[PDB]
Design a protein around this ligand. Structure first.
Ligand SMILES: *[C@@H]1O[C@H](CO)[C@@H](O[C@@H]2O[C@H](CO)[C@@H](O[C@H]3O[C@H](CO)[C@@H](O)[C@H](O)[C@@H]3O)[C@H](O)[C@H]2NC(C)=O)[C@H](O)[C@H]1NC(C)=O
Ligand SMILES: *[C@@H]1O[C@H](CO)[C@@H](O)[C@H](O)[C@H]1NC(C)=O
Lengths: 50, 49, 50, 99
């Protein structure tokens, strides 16, 4: 069974109404949710100790 | 903040955040309109500052 | 594409009044969902970056 | 205007055309692609739109491609998908030699 957890796991169950959090827009999530227009653009990067 | 940890790497997976919410609920268009309005008038800039 | 690349951008993308370039669709057509998922898929697969 | 509105078959090459080709392959839909005589992305001329927005609003063209921003004025009459590249107002500087 393709089950979900986390913010989306509790949202598709209807427990919540709106996820306000740094949630990343992508295809897999958008199947079972909808996303507002992006409010902060970003990329993926690395940290290393200086 | 810490200044002893440094970021690196070119920005791959250039994407954006977004408040996710159920398909059938009606705030979606109004939410997007308000977010765009906040982007236009610099309120998001005040939040970033 | 400067003839000598003697100039520079800012913050590598830390932008004021951030916005995006997108596609324009008719008012609430049935295509909007499909193109949204298609664009998110091409983002996920990684063709865009190249 | 009585004779044929010039159908000059040119060839198109660019980023947005590639986006269009990829989405067409993924969705399997063909396209009569054409260019508008306005030459603008579209602004409200006395309550009337032009270019991309003018053609989409009047539905002479189903969708509009190119470097089109997403703003609240445009979203009044059309709808935008998730933006694919990030733009906005930005700063351009000249390089400075070392010290
Ligand atoms: C999203 O925002 C819309 C803002 O335009 C809003 O539409 C507006 O809704 C109000 C009230 O729902 C309407 O005001 C009406 O108020 C009384 C009783 O409701 C009526 O008797 C009046 O005649 C008046 O019409 C606005 O007219 C209406 N404006 C527009 C342009 O639609 C939506 O309700 C909002 N929707 C959500 C889900 O937030
Ligand atoms: C800065 O350095 C480059 C290095 O070739 C040099 O050509 C240029 O003349 C320098 N700038 C000035 C103002 O001399």
């Amino acid at each position: 069974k393709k089950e979900w957890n986390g913010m989306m796991g509790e949202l598709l169950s209807g427990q919540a109404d709106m996820i306000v959090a740094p949630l990343t827009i992508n295809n897999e999530r958008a199947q079972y949710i909808e996303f507002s227009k992006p409010f902060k653009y970003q990329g993926l990067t690395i940290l290393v100790k200086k | 903040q810490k200044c002893d940890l440094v970021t690196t790497g070119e920005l791959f997976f250039r994407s954006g955040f977004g408040i996710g919410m159920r398909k059938d609920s009606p705030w979606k268009q109004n939410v997007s309109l308000s977010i765009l309005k906040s982007h236009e008038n610099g309120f998001m800039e005040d939040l970033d500052k | 594409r400067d003839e000598g690349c003697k100039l520079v951008t800012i913050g590598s993308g830390k932008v004021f009044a951030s916005t995006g370039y997108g596609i324009a669709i008719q008012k609430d057509s049935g295509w909007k969902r499909q193109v949204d998922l298609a664009i998110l898929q091409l983002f996920g697969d990684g063709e865009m970056e190249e | 205007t009585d004779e044929e509105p010039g159908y000059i078959k040119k060839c198109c090459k660019g980023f947005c055309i590639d986006i269009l080709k990829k989405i067409s392959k993924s969705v399997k839909f063909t396209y009569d692609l054409y260019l508008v005589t306005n030459g603008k992305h579209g602004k409200k001329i006395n309550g009337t739109w032009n270019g991309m927005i003018g053609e989409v609003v009047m539905k002479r063209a189903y969708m509009a491609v190119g470097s089109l921003t997403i703003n609240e004025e445009r979203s009044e009459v059309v709808d935008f998908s998730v933006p694919f590249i990030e733009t906005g107002i930005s700063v351009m500087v000249s390089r400075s030699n070392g010290t």
